[PDB]
């Protein structure tokens, strides 16, 4: 029944640790969590929060040339493990907590917690990775070249993750993420969109998915631009027909370049496909009746997803990195970074959602 | 105590009539509706709907050189009036209703109903205008040159309407509407945005408004584009200052062209203005707490407004045309156009809200 969940602690100067601790008792009832944190630091946060922690497994990570994972000892109802791995940085746990502040020390430490946990999951010691949020500016101050988890995951695993946001009532894949909105149009090409729609299906197996119009009213039958939507349509038909045919990546790469071959594929395609054939109008897409028609969406750009999504599911909304060799989930900071260790009230709903999501998937 | 409310019937072949008729008893309790429809066509609708209509005021309208507004007879508890005016086309009520169909004759009729109702309001015979939806394609087939209400209202009154969607919980002004999204960026200029925000304020008097970022995360301090946001800031700072100064239109046109004049205004009228100084992040803007912070917003593009607002306020959300010599409101098509006169369930909640909003306004 119990799957091992690897949890990287994020920036210790934020509300990450509080979430972790307050949630521990309920979380241990649904999976076995391993927390990537050394005891000395764990205790600094505990004392500062004035909370206690029972029956938890923590993993002290260290830089070594080889992989090695061992149970070491029990202590204060605490189970301590070590994981040695090639990190490329010397772990330094001896610094103080500085509530809500940007700091090179805790920056590097959290980057390392995450790197250690990611490879822990990659080596199959746990079933999935959950990352608590980090502050990119402390990474920057630590002299790291990465811009966030995704960038680091691309470097570790050489794959470009697909982001999917939301929860059971509504998930949305993002064709593009943190790029300026004036750049998104030229990125919507037949080649790129086809690869994305193929990978997104393979990664999720959703049975009925819909693309959101890029233009108002999905272009309104060509009167409000509509050029992007023609491309979307062409990509849907071709992906639909290709998934139905059960042919391989080699055929795909070849057919992406040959219209006559795409055409042959479309003429032989005798199914309803997995993607709706025509882009959705955003006006209708996030209403109750819209959501009942389709609740697995693909958005060409960041805000089309975020605005409606956070208006409905502020609490339970998770971030899911698809297309990597590990299952990785996350949550959004949500509050102000700087406003932490102050008994400010906290929402642990999304932490639980993200966990249950990962637990529910099949082994990679 | 009641104000007079002109109501144009939209496309008689759609659900407009039924809304009008199902709503009349309850509406007459808050205002005095004047419906713009000839008797013989009203009856064809009543019959086809199989409903009756009690103590309702209807205004037949006619092409003519002069503006004249007359009472004529009472009938089936049905006060019939005359309104003659320079319409441009010969009115023609002699046509049969075609349930849910595009037709030149109900299209042309519906345009004429609206033109009459609009001038009725301008010539002060009523307080406000409420337009029931039309179908742009029936307008096209009738040979009209206009693409919609706003298009025509610009021609009637030589003013560019500013559009505002929502309800008392949330209003969004639209800096652009049905233009291709790839084209929105170039349209965000200091000149155009300042005029917009000046007119938006003058028209609404809202004491606290926010602009929503164009780029994800409001450009994240210049890391995700940010160019558009610099321009927002520059406009916000200038308009705010102009509005405190109490200076006039002539000055404003002069100060738009001259950086030093702008600096002088900014030095003299520093201070919190009616616009928040920084664009808002769309992630946070539509949540409980966000809305509690600010609930009067301005969006740079159509879908940023439509998608979260229809997720929250599907039933109650209205359309308001600001910046015209008359008050004019409207609602969006509930159902598909196709499904009129079927006995499908019909939502009247926004019709009421729209009327409620107009009454609750001062005269013009
Ligand atoms: Ni984001
Ligand atoms: Ni629209």
From Swiss-Prot, chains A, B:
Pfam families linked to this entry: PdxA (PF04166)
Pathway listed: Cofactor biosynthesis; pyridoxine 5'-phosphate biosynthesis; pyridoxine 5'-phosphate from D-erythrose 4-phosphate: step 4/5
First-tier enzyme category under EC: oxidoreductase
HAMAP family found in the cross-reference section: PdxA_Epsilonprot
Record keywords, A-Z: Cobalt, Cytoplasm, Magnesium, Metal-binding, NAD, NADP, Oxidoreductase, Pyridoxine biosynthesis, Zinc
Gene Ontology molecular function terms on file: 4-hydroxythreonine-4-phosphate dehydrogenase activity; cobalt ion binding; magnesium ion binding; NAD binding; zinc ion binding
Binding site for a divalent metal cation: 178, 217, 302
Residues the entry annotates as binding substrate: 149-150, 310, 319, 328
Compartment annotation: Cytoplasm
GO biological process per UniProt: pyridoxal phosphate biosynthetic process; pyridoxine biosynthetic process
Gene3D superfamilies for the chain: Isopropylmalate Dehydrogenase (3.40.718.10)
Stated role: Catalyzes the NAD(P)-dependent oxidation of 4-(phosphooxy)-L-threonine (HTP) into 2-amino-3-oxo-4-(phosphooxy)butyric acid which spontaneously decarboxylates to form 3-amino-2-oxopropyl phosphate (AHAP).
Enzyme Commission number(s): 1.1.1.262
Additional information: The active site is located at the dimer interface.
Family to which the UniProt record says this protein belongs: Belongs to the PdxA family.
Catalytic reaction(s) noted: 4-(phosphooxy)-L-threonine + NAD(+) = 3-amino-2-oxopropyl phosphate + CO2 + NADH
Quaternary data: Homodimer.
Name listed for the protein in its UniProt record: 4-hydroxythreonine-4-phosphate dehydrogenase
GO cellular-component term (any): cytoplasm
Cofactor or coenzyme needed: Zn(2+); Mg(2+); Co(2+)
Superkingdom field: Bacteria
């Amino acid at each position: 029944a119990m799957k091992k969940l690897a949890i990287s602690i994020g920036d210790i100067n934020s509300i990450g640790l509080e979430i972790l601790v307050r949630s521990h008792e309920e979380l241990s009832k649904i999976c076995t969590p391993f927390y990537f944190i050394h005891e000395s630091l764990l205790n600094k946060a505990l004392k500062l929060l004035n909370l206690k922690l029972f029956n938890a497994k923590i993993v002290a990570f260290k830089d070594d040339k080889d992989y090695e994972f061992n149970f070491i000892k029990k202590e204060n109802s605490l189970e301590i493990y070590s994981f040695c791995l090639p990190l490329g940085f010397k772990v330094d746990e001896n610094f103080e907590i500085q509530a809500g502040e940007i700091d090179a020390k805790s920056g590097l430490y959290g980057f390392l917690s995450f790197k250690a946990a990611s490879y822990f999951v990659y080596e199959k010691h746990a079933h999935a990775l959950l990352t608590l949020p980090i502050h990119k500016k402390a990474w920057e101050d630590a002299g790291l070249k990465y811009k966030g988890h995704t960038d680091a995951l691309r470097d570790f695993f050489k794959k470009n993750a697909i982001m999917m946001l939301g929860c059971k009532e509504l998930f949305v894949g993002l064709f593009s993420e943190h790029i300026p909105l004036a750049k998104v149009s030229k990125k919507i090409t037949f080649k790129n969109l086809s690869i994305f729609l193929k990978d997104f299906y393979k990664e999720t197996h959703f049975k009925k998915m819909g693309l959101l119009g890029f233009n108002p009213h999905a272009g309104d039958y060509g009167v409000i631009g509509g050029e992007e939507e023609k491309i979307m349509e062409k990509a849907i038909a071709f992906v639909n027909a290709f998934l139905h045919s059960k042919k391989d990546e080699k055929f795909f790469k070849k057919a992406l370049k040959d219209e006559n071959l795409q055409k042959e594929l479309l003429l032989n395609f005798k199914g309803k496909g997995v993607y709706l054939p025509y882009p959705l109008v955003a006006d209708t897409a996030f209403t109750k009746t819209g959501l009942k028609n389709c609740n697995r969406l693909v958005a060409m750009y960041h805000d089309l997803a975020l605005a409606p999504l956070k208006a409905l599911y502020f609490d339970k909304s998770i971030n899911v990195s698809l297309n990597l060799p590990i299952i990785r989930v996350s949550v959004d900071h949500g509050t102000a970074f700087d406003k932490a260790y102050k008994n400010a009230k906290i929402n642990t709903k999304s932490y639980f959602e993200a966990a249950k999501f990962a637990i529910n998937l099949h082994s990679k």
